[PDB]
Ligand binder design. Structure first.
Ligand SMILES: *[C@@H]1O[C@H](CO)[C@@H](O)[C@H](O)[C@H]1NC(C)=O
Ligand code: NA
Lengths: 27, 251
């Protein structure tokens, strides 16, 4: 249902230190 | 995790620690998929070449952990195991094909800022995300190197998915369709890989459409740790989602 959404991150619109590296590997 | 860094608090709320009741010992990693189920590798619970073959009573599941050793009262939850489900087609004899196992908790766990389930992948998620070049994240309390050592905090590392050709002829071991490998190529520069203690842990990817994390794989095996021309192999979660839904819906 509510899976994959981190209370301390996605739930608060804050990104962790390296998730961006991941989102970029898609280019 | 080799060449990784400390995980931020709550960075991997689904990270699970498989603990041996007696003698006290960190066996493997695992993942919280619901308030009742934990996913992990099959060789963690059963592998006779090492005479490893536990039964519920032998193990405990520690959730919400950050520290490897310390018992973090009020943050981490410890749960007992009701039943252990190992894939019937699991093959350790040859190459650990279909390396997967589910564990039902005796009592459901309450979610928190530190305890949250990860999403399993679906056809759309797999086709879309399991592409060579695309990066995934691996976490764990496993050793920091092939030899020595151990981290004091959960370790995290991001790794690129490697094309099946490169994987297949990167080892003398038979690579099946239930497996996928990931890691940096010898020349790319960057390094990293899981290692002893990380087995059974998650390899997650973050969807670019909904911001949700999906566990695409389980740390399965590798020849050594962070060796050049080598790669870590992960259980292809989706490829086995049928078995998962089977036992979850049936049990
Ligand atoms: C693991 O132990 C169980 C009994 O708890 C046994 O039924 C199973 O045969 C063992 N697996 C083997 C020995 O392959
Ligand atoms: Na490597």
């Amino acid at each position: 249902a509510d899976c994959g959404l981190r209370p301390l991150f996605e739930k608060k619109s804050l990104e962790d230190k390296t998730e961006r590296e991941l989102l970029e590997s898609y280019i | 995790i080799v060449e990784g860094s400390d995980a931020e608090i709550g960075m991997s709320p689904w990270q699970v620690m498989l603990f041996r009741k007696s003698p006290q010992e960190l066996l493997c990693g695992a993942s919280l998929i619901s308030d009742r189920w934990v996913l992990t590798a099959a060789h963690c619970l059963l592998y006779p070449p090492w005479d490893k073959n536990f039964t519920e009573n032998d193990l405990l599941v520690r959730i919400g952990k950050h520290s490897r050793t310390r018992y973090e009262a009020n943050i981490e939850k410890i749960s007992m195991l009701e039943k252990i489900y190992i894939h019937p087609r699991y093959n350790w004899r040859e190459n650990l094909d279909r390396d997967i196992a589910l564990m039902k908790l005796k009592k459901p766990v309450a979610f928190s800022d530190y305890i949250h389930p990860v999403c399993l992948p679906d056809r759309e998620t797999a086709a879309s995300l399991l592409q060579a070049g695309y990066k995934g994240r691996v976490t764990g309390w496993g050793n920091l190197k092939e030899t020595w050592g151990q981290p004091s905090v959960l370790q995290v590392v991001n790794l690129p998915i490697v094309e099946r050709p490169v994987c297949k002829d990167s080892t003398r071991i038979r690579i099946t369709d239930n497996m996928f490998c990931a890691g940096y190529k010898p020349d790319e520069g960057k390094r990293g890989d899981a290692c002893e203690g990380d087995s059974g842990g998650p390899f997650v990817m973050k969807s670019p459409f909904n911001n949700r994390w999906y566990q695409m794989g389980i740390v399965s095996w590798g020849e050594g740790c962070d060796r050049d021309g080598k790669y870590g192999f992960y259980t292809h979660v989706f490829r086995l989602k049928k078995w998962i839904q089977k036992v979850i819906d049936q049990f």
